[PDB]
Design a protein around this ligand. Structure first.
Ligand code: BCB
Ligand code: BCB
Ligand code: BCB
Ligand code: BCB
Ligand SMILES: C/C=C1/c2cc3[nH]c4c(c3C)C(=O)[C@H](C(=O)OC)c4c3nc(cc4[nH]c(cc(n2)[C@@H]1C)c(C(C)=O)c4C)[C@@H](C)[C@@H]3CCC(=O)OC/C=C(\C)CCC[C@H](C)CCC[C@H](C)CCCC(C)C
Ligand SMILES: C/C=C1/c2cc3[nH]c4c(c3C)C(=O)[C@H](C(=O)OC)c4c3nc(cc4[nH]c(cc(n2)[C@@H]1C)c(C(C)=O)c4C)[C@@H](C)[C@@H]3CCC(=O)OC/C=C(\C)CCC[C@H](C)CCC[C@H](C)CCCC(C)C
Ligand SMILES: CC(C)=CCC/C(C)=C/CC/C(C)=C/CC/C(C)=C/CC/C(C)=C/CC/C(C)=C/CC/C(C)=C/CC1=C(C)C(=O)c2ccccc2C1=O
Ligand code: HEC
Ligand code: HEC
Ligand code: HEC
Ligand code: HEC
Ligand SMILES: [Fe+2]
Lengths: 273, 323, 243, 332
């Protein structure tokens, strides 16, 4: 039921609101008020997908899609069948996420550590807001959002991208894609370095923090430092959306043409034209 | 509110450290210096850097490949230095356009490309040897090298294994900024929307995972910095309150958790697979699949939508329409 | 005829797709998830063959640790529910419980690669200094959450392996004793040091080191734990709900 | 660097697919004012009278029209083609029946060409129809033509820079980029796909698995072909001032049925229509044109999608003169 070092941390407190009423554990999971609200908003969003999933033509989990309304419905309520479920689902999704986020603040305060995780978890929840709320509002319709299907939400992304002819030329995207590669690149370095110091091989002795630093100095001429790389990651990770978002929200509201032609500001400067 | 996790408030300066390898202690070159500003967000000490044979080899072949590319770029704009700086992104050294099978193509059409890539491939190989050797030399594991190899193997897959397997160098990736990006659309369209290749999906979901994992892992290590949670080796071999407060944070949120060592085994894995799935996807492409969308339509996966505008017959089927 | 098709309605691509899923879940369930169970297991109130680490400066240590002694926890059950929280019996900070808790780390000093003590004060570290530009806190007055002056900084404790300042030593006024704090609790100003984590009255009860010029792993927790414990136990308002 | 909101959007696909046009209103308008300059139809005139093949000396194409109706075609033509220069641009001022000046013989063949578009290509041009104005827009040499190489600017009423000039080799890729909507796709899709019918635009296989005997070695179409088809579409896209979802579902570019829109089939007939004008009507006019008009390979200027569409999905936003000038087709 508990980890061999866990009982000494299970103390009352940390709760943002609710007091003693919700401050308890069910299994390994912590509850709190936000753990209840999450459960409420999960169940309400899960049960309302399932309703929509039955009214559809198929139950094959890859194919299923619960799409938003047509462009004619604007920002108004759309019929339950004809997009209304999708709107219903959105609210429940955002409700749980925020509740999943805030919960982690309660867990953080009880353990007496930083709030860095839930504060790192907002960066996704924000990028989810960029797509399903901020951009549709900036284009006039909820019918610009991505549909909730496993294979189908790709088809949206594909058509979204090809609407501006060649989405790779997008400079926000270029930014965003680079941080994904570099963050994926950065992890295998850090994972690998930590593993390579603790698991050298054979009957070889474990090595020290100086060994880490020497390796990357030797190999690449520079070593960032233990604590720093973890600040580097969270940054590398975060900027996958923080910069991406800007590449998404401009496509339509602030830019209507193709994205390659955007680079005519560089290209068409008079004194090298 | 821990301001140390935001930046280094006070900076210690001292005499430089040197962990002696089993060899190449005499191949460390240069005097180390200290950037005060770097030292706020990282470690102040820049340099020195190890040389060695493999290192110089990764420069001599790496330069040679770069010198071959830039020459053919300069060619493209008739050697006009201003129209080099202007158009650079658009310039490129291309694989053959004409189908020659695998027979070595002419220098004017893909010959300089194939040769640019050889010298890239030798450079990539030389570095790997450095990434492997510097590990062993300092009594370290080879975990870094093997992940790097997986990423080398993805370049080899898209560089020269897949053209081989299908038998046409034309399939290779160009050199250049926009050009090697443009390849991504050509490739996908030719093999039927990569959004319908399962191993793209794996590739994306591991890369996305790497985002989440480092984000989450970074947040956890900074979050527990007050308990010296950055000291990850000596947290493995003598568990401190740091990684007690970590594991519990997660165990109460998502129900389970890792160790301070194993969570670095989750990242390592998740990075690795990004390249393994990416390699797997490619090796399948063109050899055993041709249109990934119709592969999904056959195996009843691909989703379907009704008609907004009226269903449009292929005019190439109508009686008496031209070719 | 097609390349890649096989008997029945089956093609090479279809078969590797299963293989991909099985290797994945093999690795997750049968490796990574067992490597997660080396610490804290077995459970209290599918395990791996234990792993030994041969230490850099002599000895070995198989994990997880079983200590020859079990420490007494001055806490008390709230309710008869299986997963009911625990309220402190005694003074929770000095007891070291909840967020004031410490791990049973070795009573050994952390060690540089060559052998020397890793975490030591600048009075010991003669070859270390503060980089020109940054503030020298030695002699500034540290001021608590209540706004009272709780002492004066008297030294810094550098990490010699990474060249990183990890602690701040301050003489507690009235008590005639020094006490360490982690920099992570210290807003470093030009003229003072703000510690919102604990009240002035509490600094006196910070865990005492065994030796003046060196600090054991367990001592680094104890001290670190104390201040983190204060964040919820400084006043009686800090434990309840915010709104 | 950017364009301010609001933005005009439409829907060409099932809700939630992100298929549709995105138009900047202040560009949409700029296009309308330009195309609104289209001179209105000259009032219909006396039907009765003898045919002009009897009346006039040299009338090989518009014989069946009565003189009054004949001269109305001759004013209208001059409005569309050469208004600033008037009738004398084609005709000898003393002798109207003379074929001294080269824009006469060229006009005759044009006159036939225009009747051919409206009669043998309604699968594309519909009931909207094409006139002399759709391409010329008030000038003898149309704004948007195409030689056997790229040239800048795309509008030939704007003075080209030295690098934009076709003699200058350094600007080559930039000439090629602006035809492909600024891409670095190293291919010329006009001279490949529209200047004749020697090439096949479709590259995607139409089966999951690779067909034996064409999926290895020298039996394969190189990847280049894919590049080139994309090149052409970027230019089609830019030519009409729209995007790929206006004619495709990006899910599957190769598939028709639900996955394409009626506009795509219409787009398809454009390709065959543009091919049929370039080979049989425009390229051969190099024997009738002076060298100041020909390219560096002696080729006569030819047309692409942009020649008629000039940035809009329908030329002149569906402006028609089909009924007003029936003598320009469709011919029974
Ligand atoms: C299937 C995948 C393809 C792909 C798809 C792709 C996309 C979609 C995008 C790119 C982009 C890029 N790709 Mg590319 N790519 C690149 C390189 C590039 C860059 C030009 C750019 C940025 C990527 C990045 O930041 O990585 C991570 C970088 C690392 C790990 C190195 C970090 C270096 C660090 C900044 C150095 C800092 C130190 C300072 C120099 C020191 C200063 C000191 C002073 C005194 C190379 C060299 C290769 C190979 C293998 O040769 C390659 C293969 C591919 N790319 C594949 C063919 N790529 C982006 C772009 O904008 O280009 C058009 C982009 O949007
Ligand atoms: C129309 C465009 C499509 C496309 C076409 C495409 C293709 C053709 C391929 C991918 C691939 C991939 N795509 Mg993908 N794609 C991806 C993401 C990805 C990656 C996860 C994956 C691997 C590529 C990579 O990591 O290279 C970055 C890392 C690289 C390239 C390795 C470099 C490491 C190397 C050791 C370093 C060398 C640097 C040297 C120092 C340089 C020296 C050079 C000198 C000598 C000149 C996302 C997240 C999306 C979204 C969200 O829309 C997407 C959409 C699309 N892709 C569209 C469907 N994509 C690859 C894949 O997974 O195949 C199935 C792939 O082959
Ligand atoms: C035509 C297709 C193109 C395209 C179209 C495209 C578009 C339209 C957009 C992107 C975007 C992006 N593209 Mg893509 N792209 C990418 C990569 C990327 C991403 C880095 C970036 C950001 C994605 C994002 O916002 O996720 C969002 C993911 C989120 C928000 C995750 C939400 C998680 C949520 C909080 C939690 C959910 C919880 C679950 C319900 C819990 C389940 C419970 C269970 C487990 C118990 C690569 C690497 C490539 C390559 C290699 O070719 C590529 C090619 C292309 N993209 C094609 C050229 N791309 C985005 C961008 O940044 O644009 C500039 C974007 O908007
Ligand atoms: C422009 C950016 C878009 C994009 C573009 C994109 C591309 C190009 C590809 C994906 C793919 C995927 N995306 Mg997607 N995406 C997904 C989820 C997914 C997964 C189904 C899959 C694998 C990614 C992964 O492993 O991540 C890392 C996280 C991991 C590994 C943790 C485990 C999470 C688990 C796999 C998620 C399962 C979700 C289920 C649908 C269940 C939903 C909850 C139910 C039970 C109520 C969610 C939940 C959201 C939300 C909530 O916004 C989202 C938004 C977007 N995606 C944007 C709209 N996505 C890949 C795929 O193959 O899809 C078919 C893929 O290739
Ligand atoms: C999940 C897998 C990820 C991953 C993993 C890993 N990646 C690793 C390792 C691992 C484990 C290392 O072991 C190794 C390393 O050291 O770690 C820092 C490495 C590397 N990853 C680099 C680049 C990179 N990774 C990318 C992607 C991913 N990586 C994916 C995402 C991308 C993208 C996205 O494009 C890029 C660009 C280089 C820094 C380095 C190779 C150096 C080389 O081979 O240089 C050889 C070439 C040279 C030395 C030429 C230098 C030119 C000189 C200046 C010429 C002088 C010019 C003169 C003026 C001429 C006249
Ligand atoms: C750069 C920043 C990165 C990042 C960062 C972090 N990520 C975190 C944290 C941090 C710091 C945590 O604190 C938190 C966590 O706990 O760690 C495991 C978390 C989490 N990251 C998850 C998913 C995830 N991260 C993604 C991406 C990144 N993460 C990027 C890369 C992606 C992508 C890319 O697709 C996915 C799918 C969940 C596992 C978890 C929240 C679940 C939840 O909120 O619980 C409660 C919610 C549920 C249990 C289900 C909710 C069902 C709703 C109501 C109905 C569904 C509607 C929905 C719209 C349907 C769409 C499906 C359709 C597309 C098919
Ligand atoms: C039964 C019931 C109704 C209870 C009510 C209470 C309640 C509200 C329960 C919540 C119910 C719900 C919705 C639970 C869902 C739980 C979730 C979010 C499940 C999804 C988990 C997934 C798929 C995560 C993907 C990320 C991933 C690959 C994780 C595996 C690796 C792990 C565990 C990383 C976490 C982890 C990280 C990131 C470290 O850095 C670290 C550092 C040092 C020590 C340990 C760790 C550590 O464990
Ligand atoms: C070139 C663009 C022309 C302009 C401008 C004008 N005309 Fe024309 N003309 C043109 C052609 C190709 C022909 C032969 C038509 C045919 O169907 O074969 C003609 C002929 C005439 C004639 C008949 C001359 C004769 O056969 O004796 C007349 C009287 C005539 N055109 C008059 C005319 C006027 C008045 C114009 C300006 C107002 C004018 N034309 C313009 C080509 C072109
Ligand atoms: C596009 C589909 C066109 C339509 C409709 C008409 N013309 Fe045309 N014209 C077109 C091309 C590609 C060219 C060659 C370029 C050039 O100007 O040389 C032309 C040219 C002419 C000319 C010659 C102008 C000159 O070179 O001085 C004339 C006199 C002309 N065209 C007349 C003309 C008439 C009478 C038309 C309707 C009956 C007509 N054009 C339609 C393209 C197109
Ligand atoms: C209508 C106006 C179109 C727009 C906008 C785009 N394309 Fe298109 N496409 C169109 C036609 C009429 C055809 C068939 C032409 C023929 O003669 O066969 C195509 C075909 C393609 C293909 C090849 C499909 C196949 O069968 O393999 C591709 C890959 C393609 N188109 C891509 C594409 C892109 C990337 C576009 C935006 C830049 C785009 N198309 C726009 C008509 C139209
Ligand atoms: C002039 C001679 C044209 C050339 C050259 C091309 N097109 Fe065209 N197009 C033209 C007209 C007069 C019309 C109106 C007919 C109508 O449908 O109302 C069109 C129409 C289209 C459309 C349909 C637009 C819609 O329904 O909203 C498309 C998709 C189209 N044309 C595409 C297209 C392409 C791809 C061309 C080059 C290959 C092309 N057109 C050439 C006139 C002319
Ligand atoms: Fe770590």
């Amino acid at each position: 039921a508990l980890l061999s070092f866990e009982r000494k941390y299970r103390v009352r407190g940390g709760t943002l609101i609710g007091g003693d009423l919700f401050d308890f554990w069910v299994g390994p999971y912590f509850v709190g008020f936000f753990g209840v609200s999450a459960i409420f908003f999960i169940f309400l969003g899960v049960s309302l997908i399932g309703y929509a999933a039955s009214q559809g033509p198929t139950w094959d989990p890859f194919a299923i899609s619960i799409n938003p309304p047509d462009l004619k419905y604007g920002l108004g309520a759309a019929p339950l069948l004809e997009g209304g479920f999708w709107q219903a689902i959105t609210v429940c999704a955002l409700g749980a996420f925020i509740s999943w986020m805030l919960r982690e603040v309660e867990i953080s305060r009880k353990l007496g550590i930083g709030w860095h995780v839930p504060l790192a978890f907002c960066v996704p929840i924000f990028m989810f807001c960029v797509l399903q709320v901020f951009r549709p509002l900036l284009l006039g319709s909820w019918g610009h959002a991505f549909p909730y299907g496993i294979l189908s939400h790709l088809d949206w992304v594909n058509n979204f991208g090809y609407q501006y002819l060649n989405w790779h030329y997008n400079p926000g995207h270029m930014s965003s894609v680079s941080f994904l590669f570099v963050n994926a690149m950065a992890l295998g370095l850090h994972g690998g370095l930590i593993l390579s110091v603790a698991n050298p091989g054979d009957g070889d002795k474990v090595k020290t923090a100086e060994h880490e630093n020497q390796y990357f100095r030797d190999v690449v001429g520079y070593s960032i430092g233990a604590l720093s790389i973890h600040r580097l990651g969270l940054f590398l990770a975060s900027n996958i959306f923080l910069t991406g978002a800007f590449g998404t929200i401009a496509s339509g509201p602030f830019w209507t043409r193709g994205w390659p032609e955007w680079w005519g500001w560089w290209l068409d400067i008079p004194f090298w034209s | 509110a821990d301001y140390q996790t935001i930046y280094t408030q006070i900076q210690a300066r001292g005499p430089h450290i040197t962990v002696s390898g089993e060899w190449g202690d005499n191949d460390r070159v240069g005097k180390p210096f200290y950037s005060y500003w770097l030292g706020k967000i990282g470690d102040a000490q820049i340099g020195p850097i190890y040389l060695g044979a493999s290192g110089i080899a990764a420069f001599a072949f790496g330069s040679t490949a770069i010198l071959i590319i830039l020459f053919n770029m300069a060619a493209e704009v008739h050697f006009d230095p201003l129209q080099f700086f202007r158009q650079f992104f658009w310039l490129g050294l291309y694989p053959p356009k004409a189908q020659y099978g695998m027979g070595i193509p002419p220098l004017h059409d893909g010959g300089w490309w194939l040769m640019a890539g050889l010298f890239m491939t030798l450079s990539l190989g030389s570095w790997w040897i450095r990434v492997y050797s510097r590990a062993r030399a300092l009594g370290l594991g080879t975990h870094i090298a093997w992940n790097f190899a997986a990423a080398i193997f993805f370049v080899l897959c898209i560089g020269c294994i897949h053209p081989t397997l299908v038998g046409s160098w034309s399939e290779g990736v160009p050199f250049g900024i926009w050009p090697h990006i443009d390849w991504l659309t050509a490739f996908s369209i030719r093999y039927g929307n990569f959004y319908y290749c399962p191993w793209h999906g794996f590739s994306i979901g591991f890369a996305y995972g790497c985002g989440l994992l480092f984000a989450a892992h970074g947040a956890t290590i900074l979050a527990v910095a007050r308990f010296g949670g950055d000291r990850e080796i000596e947290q493995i071999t003598d568990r401190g309150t740091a990684v007690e407060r970590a594991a519990l944070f997660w165990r109460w949120t998502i129900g389970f958790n890792a160790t301070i060592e194993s969570v670095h085994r989750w990242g390592w894995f998740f990075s690795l697979m990004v390249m393994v799935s990416a390699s797997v996807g490619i090796l399948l492409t063109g050899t055993f699949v041709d249109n990934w969308y119709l592969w999904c339509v056959k195996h009843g996966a691909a989703p379907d939508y009704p008609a907004y505008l009226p269903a449009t017959p292929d005019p190439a089927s109508l009686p008496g329409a031209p070719k | 005829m097609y390349h890649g098709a096989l008997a029945q309605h089956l093609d090479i691509a279809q078969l590797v797709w299963y293989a991909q899923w099985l290797v994945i879940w093999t690795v997750v369930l049968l490796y990574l998830r067992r490597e997660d169970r080396r610490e804290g297991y077995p459970l209290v109130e599918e395990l791996p063959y234990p792993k030994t680490f041969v230490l850099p400066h002599g000895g070995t240590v198989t994990v997880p640790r079983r200590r020859p002694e079990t420490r007494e926890l001055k806490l008390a059950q709230t309710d008869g529910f299986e997963g009911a929280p625990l309220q402190p019996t005694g003074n929770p900070l000095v007891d070291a419980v909840g967020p004031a808790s410490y791990a049973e780390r070795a009573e050994v000093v952390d060690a540089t690669v060559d052998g020397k003590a890793k975490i030591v004060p600048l009075r010991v570290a003669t070859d270390f200094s503060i980089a020109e530009g940054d503030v020298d806190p030695r002699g500034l007055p540290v001021v608590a959450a209540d706004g009272v002056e709780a002492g004066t900084v008297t030294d810094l404790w550098v990490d010699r392996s990474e060249h990183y300042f990890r602690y701040l030593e301050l003489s507690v006024a009235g008590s005639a004793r020094t006490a360490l704090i982690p920099l992570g609790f210290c807003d470093v100003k030009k003229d003072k040091i703000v510690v919102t984590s604990i009240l002035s009255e509490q600094f006196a009860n910070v865990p005492r080191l065994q030796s003046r010029d060196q600090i054991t792993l367990r001592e680094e927790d104890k001290v670190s734990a104390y201040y983190a414990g204060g964040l919820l136990y400084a006043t009686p308002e800090r434990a309840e709900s915010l709104l | 660097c950017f364009e301010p909101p609001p933005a005009t959007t439409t829907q060409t696909g099932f809700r939630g697919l992100s298929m549709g046009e995105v138009l900047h209103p202040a560009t949409v308008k700029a296009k309308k004012e330009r195309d609104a300059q289209y001179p209105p139809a000259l009032a219909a005139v006396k039907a009765e009278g003898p045919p002009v093949s009897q009346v006039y000396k040299n009338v090989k194409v518009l014989g069946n029209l009565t003189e009054a109706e004949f001269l109305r075609t001759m004013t209208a033509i001059t409005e569309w083609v050469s208004p600033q220069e008037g009738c004398t641009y084609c005709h000898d001022e003393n002798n109207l029946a003379s074929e001294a000046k080269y824009p006469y013989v060229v006009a005759r063949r044009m006159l036939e060409m225009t009747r051919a578009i409206n009669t043998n290509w309604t699968q594309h041009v519909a009931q909207t129809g094409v006139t002399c104005y759709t391409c010329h827009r008030g000038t003898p040499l149309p704004p948007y033509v195409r030689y056997l190489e790229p040239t800048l600017p795309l509008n030939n009423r704007e003075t080209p820079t030295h690098v934009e000039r076709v003699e200058t080799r350094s600007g080559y890729v930039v000439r090629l980029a602006k035809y492909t909507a600024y891409s670095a796709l190293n291919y010329d899709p006009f001279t490949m796909f529209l200047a004749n019918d020697k090439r096949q635009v479709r590259v995607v296989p139409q089966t999951a698995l690779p067909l034996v005997g064409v999926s290895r070695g020298k039996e394969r179409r190189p990847l280049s072909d894919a590049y080139a088809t994309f090149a052409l579409m970027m230019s089609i896209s830019d030519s009409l001032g729209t995007n790929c979802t206006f004619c495709h579902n990006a899910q599957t570019f190769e598939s028709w049925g639900k996955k394409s829109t009626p506009q795509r089939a219409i787009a398809w007939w454009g390709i065959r229509m543009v091919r049929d004008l370039n080979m049989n009507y425009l390229a051969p006019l190099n024997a009738s044109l002076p060298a100041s008009r020909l390219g560096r390979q002696g080729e006569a200027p030819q047309a692409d999608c942009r020649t008629c569409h000039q940035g809009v999905t329908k030329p002149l936003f569906g402006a028609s003169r089909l009924k007003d000038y029936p003598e320009l087709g469709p011919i029974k």
